[PDB]
């Protein structure tokens with residue numbers, strides 16, 4: 001019942017500062033414009049110890065499966081090749097991506113009927129709010 005309250009199908013309903021987050025990560029102009037338009041659905045499921053997070057949008061479809069605390073390789077929607085580790089910290093999924101000597105952290109939490117995603121690169125935060133689909 002690890003992650004029960006995250007499981008389901010979620011749709012993006014608001015975003016703030018995502019362009020600035022993407023700039024801080026190193027995303028180029030054209031990818032930022034097309035990625036910033038997307039309204040992804042996030043689909044989260046759990047089978048035993050394996051958590052799967054899918055993102056489906058008109059920009060890119062992605063899928064990661066992982067065990068908490070166990071590093072994995074991830075190709076992000078913006079085409080970075082990163083090494084990722086996801087843990088649970090006080091009920092928050094904390095996802096750290098490392099590449100090219102850089103690091104970004106993505107936190108996913110349940111707040112009321114929302115799933116809130118906070119993306120941080122250095123001093124820049126983007127907040128992306130999802131509701132049940």
Ligand SMILES: Oc1nc(S)nnc1Cc1ccc2c(c1)OCO2
Nearest residue numbers: 022025027035040076077078117128
């Ligand atoms: O649109 C998205 N929304 C959520 S919450 N997560 N991933 C995505 C997909 C995505 C697009 C562009 C990006 C990125 C990730 O990282 C830097 O540039």
